[PDB]
Amino acid sequence: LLLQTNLINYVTSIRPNIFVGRAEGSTQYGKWYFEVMVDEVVPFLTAQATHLRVGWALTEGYSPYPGGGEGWGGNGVGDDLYSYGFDGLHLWTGHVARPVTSPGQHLLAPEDVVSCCLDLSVPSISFRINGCPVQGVFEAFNLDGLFFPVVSFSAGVKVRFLLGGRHGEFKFLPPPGYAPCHEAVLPRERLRLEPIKEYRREGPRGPHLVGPSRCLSHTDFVPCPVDTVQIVLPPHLERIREKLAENIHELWALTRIEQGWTYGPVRDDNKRLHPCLVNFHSLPEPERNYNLQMSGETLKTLLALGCHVGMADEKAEDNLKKTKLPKTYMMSNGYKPAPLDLSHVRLTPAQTTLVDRLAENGHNVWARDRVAQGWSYSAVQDIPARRNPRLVPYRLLDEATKRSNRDSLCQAVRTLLGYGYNIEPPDQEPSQVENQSRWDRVRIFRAEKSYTVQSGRWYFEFEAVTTGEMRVGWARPELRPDVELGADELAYVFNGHRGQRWHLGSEPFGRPWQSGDVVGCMIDLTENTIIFTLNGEVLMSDSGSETAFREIEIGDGFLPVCSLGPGQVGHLNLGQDVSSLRFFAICGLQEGFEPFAINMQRPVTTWFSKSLPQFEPVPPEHPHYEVARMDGTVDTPPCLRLAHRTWGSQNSLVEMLFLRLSLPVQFHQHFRCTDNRDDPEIILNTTTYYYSVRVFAGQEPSCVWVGWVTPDYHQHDMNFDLSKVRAVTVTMGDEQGNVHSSLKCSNCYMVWGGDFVSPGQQGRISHTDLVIGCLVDLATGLMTFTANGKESNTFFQVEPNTKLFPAVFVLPTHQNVIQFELGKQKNIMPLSAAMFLSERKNPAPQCPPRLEVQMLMPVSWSRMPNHFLQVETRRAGERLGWAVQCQDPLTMMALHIPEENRC
Amino acid sequence: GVEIETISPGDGRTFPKKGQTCVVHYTGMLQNGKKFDSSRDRNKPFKFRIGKQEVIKGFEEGAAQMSLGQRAKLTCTPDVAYGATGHPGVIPPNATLIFDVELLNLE
Amino acid sequence: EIFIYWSKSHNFKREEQNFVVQNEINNMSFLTADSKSKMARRGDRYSVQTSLIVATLKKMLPIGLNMCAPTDQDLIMLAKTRYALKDTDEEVREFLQNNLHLQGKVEGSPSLRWQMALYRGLPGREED
């Protein structure tokens, strides 16, 4: 009942810029191997043991926000199901430690080898300690997303990243088929050591609040071109089928003539004397007509893209000539330009963009073909192993290769343009790469509510390091953490990406800034005005007025606030030190304005919106959803009932809903070895607990999920189904084979409601309410599911000491949706005893006020710690590799909620 | 009853026999993971004479098995723990105890 | 002092809008031409806010506030009182000479500590 406190160490994670994954038509390799070496580990720097885990993680939900959180704080690798780690004695996953027998098992000490092997062909994560393999492998784990190395450490450690090759030596031969992790680096980027997705980093003049980091995706490694098969070739194209091929038969050969690669009559192409400028008739026939139909293939790509041709002016054939230059002169059958010659011709930017995407669709077809022949990516070229440094999609390619591809086809489209045939741009369709996670894009930083000001003249500098979406201004204390600033009355802000002021919408104001611009925000509660100054210059509206907002009521008060879009960096200088300010002397000082934190010893505590879902109760004033608590009757137990009030009306909110009860059930410490009346001798000693859900008519069972979730469920997916459920099974055995433990672990345990309805020909609007029932035995750890009181084939086995919250996920489709019936059956004990310890022998079903229906807020507020761990990550040497060093201890007093198991 | 799960091996030769104080930095935990006791917060080692029955019997028999500087774990069953009565106000009756035993030194 | 004549002369004010109406002074281009080049109804005929004289006063008034001292603030509000009492240049000087020891004390308010910290923090300041 009572909240428990403790002192808990700060734990942070560190990753290399090496992300791996598997997908249909992927350009990656699903076998990787990295190592981590221990330099110095202090057994006990603080009261709590020093944290150190090494393993893998996932790019789509592993967000290790420092401080409190799931379990008992200090979250690292293994706390949630997006990470898989090995501390030296246990395989951590889902905040559970499972002992593993090892040849010389102990906690990671100095001079210890942590060899991580990851096969993605079949899901398997292997660990080796000092060459001897750790007798435990993860299996049946989620693969969607990407996988990357990660080390989770508390203060007082030194570790080294042995990534092999130029970045280490591995000190041990890697297992066959597994590649060193340094070979997965993307061509554009250079390898470095960085933490996981964060909100803050050190800065030269001051700390910089960091807008969310753009993350690469597995879908960005599959090359997806436009299909160039179902295209009937037009007459105007077959009419020009020849010159556009003749001009690309030796265009790659033209550059190197009169150099060391100068042709000779005895040999031909690919013999280090390649050119052969004569003609393609001398060249082999198959590659010849292949080059013709490759010119046709480029024209077919132009068709599929949306390019069409039209002839207006004088025929270029007349006013074009071939130039027998003094250079490129050859003795083999006369001298001529290697491609077909061309005179003065230019190209507009539409043609530049079009040839760019034309080269893109050439590269992605080449990469697709290579993948279909088995090839994959590796930063070092291995021809016998069939790996290339350029098997990445064009968007991920390097600028050198981009330019090299674009040059040839730029010449080609130039030759097309010379003949006067128009290059017609297609229609423009605006598209967004990622749309579902609208909340990860926006992060809102604001001062703590205790710092609220209701009077005076306040000034703070928001030095925009980059030039992205940054809304800065003043927000009322009760500002919501998930709505964009200015969408309501709760925030008066200025947007500087495209220059407007936001309040219940947008209106033009000021000029968009550039990089390194210090945005100073005024506020004056005497005359109730808001003014913005950019680089010491007062921003102006579309009039002579110099006030952004006016007639602002006092209200609860105003707080300094700023927001940052993805991949953005900004400095929020609250003017704690007056001398540190830059444009304060220019404006505000002579006007009577004050720094917001002019006389404060501690820095202003900042609260940042955390886009990590947490189940919270529903306010009764909710616009769309409401929950009914109906008293029980003589025949039915009391029920919790959910209705959609605005459904069937205009502007109603219909979306994926995550719903769960407010109280957990904990499985016992140890499990057992190996009419319609309850029988008194059975209902007293039974260990099975049951609850029923009555899906109402009009609500489609095919979008209803019923089951139980662990309290670490933070999956806010718009398109949720049983496939997105996080699950992992730990396989444990002795040294050779003999798997003696294979446990199925998950955070979400749900059954799809569409599997309990008869697939009739018509009549999906069932007049019978689907009554899904769930039984859980706490003495064995098994649970079943009943479609209509009759048992189904589905079941689940969970480990002891497991906490499960009753959850039912639903997409609303009717006024009457779902009713939670905390009922009971013949000799089956209701949840009124599985929730409250004082009512263990009371079979009467009850719904006390603490038991409540909670849905999932995607974003909740959080507090930024006043200090962060000082971590040194740098390359120690050529053979040592990257090194991590953390010395200064830092402890945080975390209050813990007992039942939800989150502090 | 009492079983040892070594976390960090010690020397393996010097074992505290009958007649000398056992100096230890213990970290007791409940079966549910809720820590109920420790000694590094108090920053003073828990010095108890061996064999004088000054500590709970499970800890007593566990402390003899390991050696100097051995970080280990002990699963104190209710039989060799407080058991029926528990610890009044701290430990509930009939509960399993887990200890992060660390015999740092002997006198 | 010119603006003092502007406020103290209603005739200069009365023919000020005369000059505006026969010269078709917009007073918008004269204040927004720079804003137009920076790539960013009610009293359009004439209004107090569009008075170019009060504009040039307010554009560089903080130069005058800057050249004074923060401990002289209370000297400013007691001078607001005397100017509300219609005291001209001759008697305001002698009353301020009486009020020489009435100047503000930096220890009296925390805001004066940092204000003097920055005020001597400017390199162009001399204590004499």
UniProtKB/Swiss-Prot annotation, chain A:
Detected in skeletal muscle (at protein level). Fast- or slow-twitch skeletal muscle. It is found in: Sarcoplasmic reticulum membrane. Residues 1-168, 384-579, 675-827 form the B30.2/SPRY domain. Changing G420S: Decreases protein stability. Sequence repeats lie at residues 212-325, 326-439. The N-terminus is blocked. Channel activity is modulated by phosphorylation. It comes from the Eukaryota. Residues 40-51 are annotated as: Interaction with FKBP1A. Homotetramer. Can also form heterotetramers with RYR2. Identified in a complex composed of RYR1, PDE4D, PKA, FKBP1A and protein phosphatase 1 (PP1). Repeated very high-level exercise decreases interaction with PDE4D and protein phosphatase 1 (PP1). Interacts with CALM; CALM with bound calcium inhibits the RYR1 channel activity. Interacts with S100A1. Interacts with FKBP1A; this stabilizes the closed conformation of the channel. Interacts with CACNA1S; interaction with CACNA1S is important for activation of the RYR1 channel. Interacts with CACNB1. Belongs to the ryanodine receptor (TC 1.A.3.1) family. RYR1 subfamily. The calcium release channel activity resides in the C-terminal region while the remaining part of the protein constitutes the 'foot' structure spanning the junctional gap between the sarcoplasmic reticulum (SR) and the T-tubule. Pore opening is mediated via the cytoplasmic calcium-binding domains that mediate a small rotation of the channel-forming transmembrane regions that then leads to channel opening. Binding of [3H]ryanodine indicates that the heterozygous channel is activated by Ca(2+) concentrations 4-fold lower than normal. Single-cell analysis of cotransfected cells shows a significantly increased resting cytoplasmic Ca(2+) level and a significantly reduced luminal Ca(2+) level. Cytosolic calcium-activated calcium channel that mediates the release of Ca(2+) from the sarcoplasmic reticulum into the cytosol and thereby plays a key role in triggering muscle contraction following depolarization of T-tubules. Repeated very high-level exercise increases the open probability of the channel and leads to Ca(2+) leaking into the cytoplasm. Can also mediate the release of Ca(2+) from intracellular stores in neurons, and may thereby promote prolonged Ca(2+) signaling in the brain. Required for normal embryonic development of muscle fibers and skeletal muscle. This is Ryanodine receptor 1. The chain holds residues 631 to 1647 of 5037 of the full protein.
From Swiss-Prot, chain B:
InterPro entries: FKBP-type_PPIase (IPR050689), PPIase_dom_sf (IPR046357), PPIase_FKBP_dom (IPR001179). It is found in: Cytoplasm; Sarcoplasmic reticulum. Keywords: Cytoplasm, Isomerase, Rotamase, Sarcoplasmic reticulum. It catalyses: [protein]-peptidylproline (omega=180) = [protein]-peptidylproline (omega=0). Detected in heart muscle (at protein level). Isoform 1 and isoform 2 are ubiquitous with highest levels in brain and thymus. Identified in a complex composed of RYR2, FKBP1B, PKA catalytic subunit, PRKAR2A, AKAP6, and the protein phosphatases PP2A and PP1. Interacts directly with RYR2. Has the potential to contribute to the immunosuppressive and toxic effects of FK506 and rapamycin. PPIases accelerate the folding of proteins. It catalyzes the cis-trans isomerization of proline imidic peptide bonds in oligopeptides. This is Peptidyl-prolyl cis-trans isomerase FKBP1B.
